[PDB]
Amino acid sequence: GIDPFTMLPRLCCLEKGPNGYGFHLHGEKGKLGQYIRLVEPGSPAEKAGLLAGDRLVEVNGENVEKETHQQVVSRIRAALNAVRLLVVDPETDEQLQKLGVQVREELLRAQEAPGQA
């Protein structure tokens, strides 16, 4: 059939809620392999479009895969109010990696939509 343009890592700006953002991130004890384990239904994370099955690739625009599990979490915690979490479905990542285009922000920063917040 026809497949759409699968190359759209979603940038989720997570707001500092009560004492964090409201998700549980699980990481494999190496470097690359940080995935969301569980999301709090009462978090700013879930409304940002962050799902309990996504992988975190970049924080605010810079890649955090080659960090440590601690450092990855620290990246998000280092944000006072808002932090831009770039997340993608691990299933979709398989397709995306094969494209390897500048989807990092070049694609993400498409046309502007003035109106809603």
């Binding site: 964090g20 998700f23 991130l25 384990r37 998000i76 915690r77």
Partner: peptide, 5 residues
């Protein structure tokens, strides 16, 4: 036990 943010 995962990591809470």
């Amino acid at each position: 036990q995962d990591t809470r943010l």
